[PDB]
Amino acid sequence: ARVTVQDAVEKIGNRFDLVLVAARRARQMQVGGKDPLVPEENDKTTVIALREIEEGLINNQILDVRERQEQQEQEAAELQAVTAIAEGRR
Amino acid sequence: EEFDAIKIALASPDMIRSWSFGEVKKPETINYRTFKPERDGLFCARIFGPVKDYECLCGKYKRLKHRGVICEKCGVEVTQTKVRRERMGHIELASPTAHIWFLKSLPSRIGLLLDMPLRDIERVLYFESYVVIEGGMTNLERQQILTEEQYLDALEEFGDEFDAKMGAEAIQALLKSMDLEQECEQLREELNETNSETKRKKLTKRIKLLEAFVQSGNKPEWMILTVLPVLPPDLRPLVPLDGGRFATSDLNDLYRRVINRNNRLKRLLDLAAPDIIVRNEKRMLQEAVDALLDNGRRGRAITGSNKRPLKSLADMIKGKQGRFRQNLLGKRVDYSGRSVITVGPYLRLHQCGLPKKMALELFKPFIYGKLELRGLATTIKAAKKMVEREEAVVWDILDEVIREHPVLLNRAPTLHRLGIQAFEPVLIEGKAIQLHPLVCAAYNADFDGDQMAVHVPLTLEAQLEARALMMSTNNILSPANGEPIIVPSQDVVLGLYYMTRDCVNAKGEGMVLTGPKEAERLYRSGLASLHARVKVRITEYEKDANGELVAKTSLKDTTVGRAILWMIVPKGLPYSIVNQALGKKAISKMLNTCYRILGLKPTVIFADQIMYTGFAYAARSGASVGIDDMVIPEKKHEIISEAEAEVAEIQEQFQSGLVTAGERYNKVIDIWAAANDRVSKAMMDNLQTETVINRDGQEEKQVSFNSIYMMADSGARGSAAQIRQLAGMRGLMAKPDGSIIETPITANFREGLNVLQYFISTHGARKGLADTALKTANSGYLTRRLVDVAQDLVVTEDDCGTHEGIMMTPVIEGGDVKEPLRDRVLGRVTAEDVLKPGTADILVPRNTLLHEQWCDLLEENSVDAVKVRSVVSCDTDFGVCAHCYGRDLARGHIINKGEAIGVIAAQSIGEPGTQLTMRVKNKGSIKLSNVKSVVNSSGKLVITSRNTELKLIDEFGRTKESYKVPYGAVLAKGDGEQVAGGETVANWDPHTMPVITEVSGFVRFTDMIDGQTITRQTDELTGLSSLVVLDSAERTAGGKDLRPALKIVDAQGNDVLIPGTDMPAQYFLPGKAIVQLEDGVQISSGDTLARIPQTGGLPRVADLFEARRPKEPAILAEISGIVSFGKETKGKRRLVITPVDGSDPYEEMIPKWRQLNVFEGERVERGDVISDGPEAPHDILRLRGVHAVTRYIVNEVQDVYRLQGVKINDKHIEVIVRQMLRKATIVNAGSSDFLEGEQVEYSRVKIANRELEANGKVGATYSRDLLGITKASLATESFISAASFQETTRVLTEAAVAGKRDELRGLKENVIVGRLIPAGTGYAYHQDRMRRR
Amino acid sequence: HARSTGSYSLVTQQPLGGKAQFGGQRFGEMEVWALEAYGAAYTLQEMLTVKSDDVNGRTKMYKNIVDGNHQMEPGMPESFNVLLKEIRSLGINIELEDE
DNA sequence: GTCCTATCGATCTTCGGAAGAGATTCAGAG
DNA sequence: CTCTGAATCTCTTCCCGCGCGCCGTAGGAC
Ligand SMILES: [Zn+2]
Ligand SMILES: [Zn+2]
């Protein structure tokens, strides 16, 4: 559980950007749930997000770094499908 | 439909026909026996839509398989019934009808366009007189209204070469004949024809209306309604009530009246009824449309009940019960509840207890979200049943769901943001909401049956926002000033005061304790007393300049209670904070110091531990209160017995005629006041002296452990004014007219008050109660005005780059300083480089935030004036730069980009509005400001200046005393003399204004005659008189134009000249003067020629923000130069101001009864005071500048709070000031397309001038205009915010004719349209959208 | 008293008000100002669109909350549209705009 | 009884608001 | 003779919730 969020606020230098980033991460962990980068304590993803930020392993850039990379993987398999389909018709 | 703007304009009749799906004809809705909707009525099924969910009225189709088809048994179209609330109809009026709004707005738009008076247009519209149109070859003007007798003349004098219509038909024909653009051009050239400002201003208004109509696609006839659309029926339901009856609907009856009247008119027009009958029917139809649109603007509103007028469309739009403030700005929300709160001391700062029943009834869907996820329930159908069964497993599901889900708690009313907070909930058996003690201060929550509401944040972002912004632990500092909101409660502070207090002789005294822990053991073993004096080895940690704690251990002389409490204080503080008897003041800074050093996380736990310890040791204290504790000093009976006797002596004088009536009263009341002071002092002395104890030998006194004394001294409750009434005497009282009672209430509540004493007390009691009950409304109205004038401002940029600002100095008025420099300048950024006291040495960089350390550094130096950036001066368009605003008072750092400063400032100003009322001193050095003074005969410095101010600077080099000395005062202590406190600095005549000369020389009554200009008075006291100068009002021109003059004369023909001055020593006399130095008298320098004899609380600030003109306007002189008079006082006097160069003939009318600060030759400047009394913020801004008016507003609004003890950060006011003068009036049109003279929004004029000067063309010149809040709120360029505030029936027309368009910028509009606000996280989203664009 | 879901008013679909009726607490203008005092925008948007006004949205929110998604679709507060009709019933043509 | 039409189309709708702001008239005013 | 003064007109406004509890078309013609 989190009583304060001061450490994360010191990490992400804005009171509001922390809210938005934590929303992004907790949504990821909730729907299509990616496992968190912190040991759980029977918490709700919300607080778990605020756990990850204080450890300094999640922010905008890292999430962007993931998202873009994830997209590439999702694009990469597409080629493997398309070529295979193009092969299978022959 | 996705949208980005809202556009408002007039609706053309064909547009209305485009809106409509049918024409309502039959004024019937439903049968009185069957509930089917009658066709072609107000509830026609085929016009607006079917009533059944997916079935037609005729029943031919009852399936989605036939969706969208049209039946032919009834004609109704089968679709979703919801569409029934969106389709509209239209009624084609048998004759035109004027739109009531546009007829009777604040001006008359229809009247203004035709330049025809509202009375005459109403007379025409209501069929009272003809108006000739297309008069042709007749002596009949363009409009030229004419009565029926006049019309009866034109019927035979002329034939058909003239046309004179009646009613709305004539107005529609006139509008259809309006050559709008040509008329506007002709009028804009006619404007230059005459300089009649009285008509030029309304001509500018008329041409502005014409230009607005020309530019907009609106056409004149659209002001006359021809087709009236009908509201969708589902928005005006005819709901049934208990039994076979339908509830009355207001709009339905108005529509019924209109339809019936119009059908009658159509029937007659078909049957060719006589002209008189058709005219009467048309008038009735027009008045019925009037009742339908804006019922009440008619001569009398119609009603169908006991004089309860029917609500119209315009009634439903505006009003406190209207849509804007009833359903859009504030709407009832699901997932919420309320209950009676109670205090749970066991809760942490971040928790609150809620009942199990309320938790189950609020988190119901979440519980379902587990029942499916747990697999324990099949679906919602069984999940709801299981929840109803309140199964013991469902409580486990609730205990899992509620684990980390915040709940919002808010008490009604919620004046400031601290009234809504997020709490982590915990289940409680009862039905009351468990609230934390330390939080109850923020809510202003007394637990005497106080209800409070809970709201459940549902979505993920809502939970995160609650936990990050609204959590209890995130709001430990008040946003209004640097003051904690977790100030220790009343009970806790009593416990700490009792624990840390020390007694002379006590059990366990004088021993040595090896550490705090052992001390605690001693108390719990009973071997020592809590107040015993002892030596305990203390160890403390001090963090270095880098930030690592340094451990130091020592022996300390202290008390057992303090040593015990030291086990709770965190490892970063000195022992000296706990080595003193803590009270509500002394403890508070302690807590604050923790936040200053350790941080937020140690601070919250330290506060919780302090509360725990305070409660526990206050319970151990058992500090009861009883009648034995209220002490009456024995001398009191004597103090009365003497004091009354003295009044008897004052009575004896009145019994002997030796005193006047008033003097007896004002001596008796003063003697009683002195007696009351003596009684109070004796009572307090007895209260503290009641404790004396033996320290191993001989009695010794000490501080008193009396229950009332400890309650008062700890500051918990019952201050000195309470104990004085409980144990001294109640004292004097006031009548409802405020008169001081000659006979004070010489009793105190411990003793019985008699019948008359209680009846006297009732006056003040009821006055206070009525004051509260009446002021609670004006406070709220002021809050609403502030929020609606400042809702727009948001910190939307980092640095604006400006270098101006405002200079901060300690407030020095009435002698000694009332507030230091540190309070004003803390938390702002420097405007320019801060200089070292002296020369050529700077101390702080030009744009550095002055936090606590730099404030201490400045206070170390002798710096008194510091210029710092202010929100008013920041040059950011449509927003406020972050650097100007500076520190966020609730965080300590600089304010983030995206915070809504406007609402925060408005709440900060308006929260204490319910606390107001609605009913030489030290040695220093003499400094003179604006003091032009001359040497008299004795060489003393006698003032020849009228704006003279006296400033006193102490030995350490800072001004600590300030004074104002009027004109004609003699400066005993001048030329920088050092004078001790209490030694007379200067002297003045407190009654009359004296007039003095500069040179020494002979005089004569130049151009004066006895009787004509002076009265041969006798001075009956002696018989030798000082001549009395005749006034201008007491004498005709033979004495008015013969103005008295006491010009100094000499044999040389001129007086001894001052170097560079040619002015003769000419002096004169005003009215009411008393002059002794007659002809042949030698007047020395500094000799008095003659003498001339002579507020609020909350409203004082409410009218200040509204910028109301004073009842007694102190006239400030303008331009500069030397003043003059014009012609004398007939009706009202006329004067002229002559500058050294420029426009010499500037005149101004002046009131006669207002004495003038200048007579005929006084050097004057812009802003120079000519009369006393309050100034005018408009005039101050126009004459002394934006900084001057801002300083005036800030100081005069802080003088109200300082008197009442309320502290508000000055910045919170400046923002509102920024809103007052957000508009500017153009001085020269220049190369800009702006009108010659017009008020344009300052942001727009500034951006246009910026680009114009970038292109090198003549930028516009403007004067910033100070608008009061009540008007500036309605003057915005976004009509939605203005119409949501007040005068909606006016704004919704003024913007309509202008074809206004809203960009939805601001908070209120976005709240209305249900999208994210442009602040906070919403600002982050909008900023991301704009940057990715 | 506490309310999860129940009766909704007819002219505007906001929940009923009272104890004898299964109604919810009124979120006054002062509470809106206080929410704006913090940076909470999502909280306000939810509170005044999904919980109270947007008829289509408050069902889609219900499904997600039961589904455990915790995401809202704000749409537009129905009451606002009613206002437009009240103004469109006059001789005023007020309408939304694209750009 | 039902169901109708119309709404002081022969009265007097309340006198215990204050103010504040414009808007609209008037008044010596040259 | 109107102009540019005041003076005299009408219109707008007045804290937030919360509960009770009643009380809620009318007269006239077939
Ligand atoms: Zn049908
Ligand atoms: Zn700035």
Side-chain angles (χ1 to χ4, degrees), chain C residues 49-70:
Chain C
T49 61
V50 164
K51 285 178 170 177
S52 176
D53 219 309
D54 189 294
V55 200
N56 296 32
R58 58 192 183 190
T59 54
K60 272 71 177 182
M61 165 103 284
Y62 199 2
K63 271 60 191 178
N64 299 331
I65 294 296
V66 176
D67 195 20
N69 186 27
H70 292 46

Side-chain angles (χ1 to χ4, degrees), chain C residues 74-89:
Chain C
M76 171 169 52
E78 171 67 25
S79 60
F80 167 62
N81 288 328
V82 177
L83 162 69
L84 283 190
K85 299 310 168 187
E86 289 183 340
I87 303 185
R88 200 157 298 187
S89 169

Side-chain angles (χ1 to χ4, degrees), chain B residues 1128-1166:
Chain B
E1128 271 298 327
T1129 321
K1130 216 188 194 313
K1132 225 58 168 184
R1133 60 182 55 169
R1134 297 87 180 182
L1135 288 78
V1136 173
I1137 292 185
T1138 296
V1140 180
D1141 52 323
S1143 185
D1144 303 6
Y1146 158 70
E1147 68 158 303
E1148 197 72 14
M1149 283 181 56
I1150 285 191
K1152 58 180 69 180
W1153 79 96
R1154 295 303 180 187
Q1155 62 277 315
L1156 304 191
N1157 201 15
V1158 303
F1159 332 101
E1160 195 70 20
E1162 280 60 29
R1163 223 292 175 180
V1164 105
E1165 305 83 358
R1166 46 186 301 180

Side-chain angles (χ1 to χ4, degrees), chain B residues 227 307 548 651 766 806 963 1041 1134 1173 1178:
Chain B
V227 284
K307 292 187 186 66
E548 295 308 318
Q651 188 71 10
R766 185 169 287 190
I806 51 176
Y963 289 94
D1041 203 5
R1134 297 87 180 182
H1178 309 266

Side-chain angles (χ1 to χ4, degrees), chain B residues 1-11 15 19 85-86 88 99 101-102 225 229 231 235 239 255 293 313 316-317 323-338 361-362 364-366 368-369 372 410 414 417-418 420 453 455-463 465 469-470 475 784 787 899-900 903-904 907 1292 1296 1301 1307-1308 1311-1314 1316-1317 1319-1322, chain C residues 1-19 22-56 58 61-99:
Chain B
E1 175 190 18
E2 185 275 340
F3 58 94
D4 209 357
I6 287 185
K7 169 182 176 59
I8 177 177
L10 302 195
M15 166 59 62
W19 288 341
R85 91 192 322 264
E86 199 231 347
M88 303 181 53
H99 200 165
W101 272 8
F102 303 102
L225 291 180
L231 205 62
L235 298 187
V239 288
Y255 275 109
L293 291 171
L313 296 170
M316 293 187 61
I317 291 177
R323 283 292 173 268
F324 273 97
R325 297 173 56 189
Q326 191 65 74
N327 299 336
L328 264 51
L329 296 171
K331 53 185 68 183
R332 302 188 168 278
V333 301
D334 280 329
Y335 296 89
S336 63
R338 80 189 298 102
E361 294 170 352
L362 292 175
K364 254 183 184 178
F366 295 84
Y368 300 157
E372 298 178 7
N410 64 276
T414 150
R417 36 169 277 177
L418 303 178
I420 309 190
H455 301 268
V456 171
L458 305 180
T459 70
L460 183 79
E461 303 90 346
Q463 306 174 14
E465 257 181 358
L469 315 167
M470 323 181 68
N475 291 259
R784 171 169 176 80
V787 301
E899 176 62 284
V903 191
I904 298 183
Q907 293 178 345
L1292 229 61
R1301 165 196 241 263
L1307 280 62
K1308 200 174 192 180
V1311 170
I1312 290 181
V1313 301
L1316 287 183
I1317 63 176
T1321 58
Chain C
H1 162 56
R3 165 189 169 96
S4 54
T5 308
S7 308
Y8 292 100
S9 179
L10 298 181
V11 42
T12 169
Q13 298 305 308
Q14 304 179 357
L16 266 62
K19 169 67 175 184
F22 200 50
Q25 295 308 314
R26 165 171 179 84
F27 208 58
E29 207 180 4
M30 302 179 174
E31 289 78 355
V32 178
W33 306 339
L35 265 176
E36 297 170 9
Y38 319 102
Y42 292 96
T43 299
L44 255 180
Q45 186 187 28
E46 166 187 343
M47 202 83 59
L48 70 93
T49 61
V50 164
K51 285 178 170 177
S52 176
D53 219 309
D54 189 294
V55 200
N56 296 32
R58 58 192 183 190
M61 165 103 284
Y62 199 2
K63 271 60 191 178
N64 299 331
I65 294 296
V66 176
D67 195 20
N69 186 27
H70 292 46
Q71 182 175 318
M72 59 178 176
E73 295 76 13
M76 171 169 52
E78 171 67 25
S79 60
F80 167 62
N81 288 328
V82 177
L83 162 69
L84 283 190
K85 299 310 168 187
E86 289 183 340
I87 303 185
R88 200 157 298 187
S89 169
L90 306 175
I92 306 299
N93 165 82
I94 173 179
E95 70 179 26
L96 300 170
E97 225 287 67
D98 189 11
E99 285 81 356

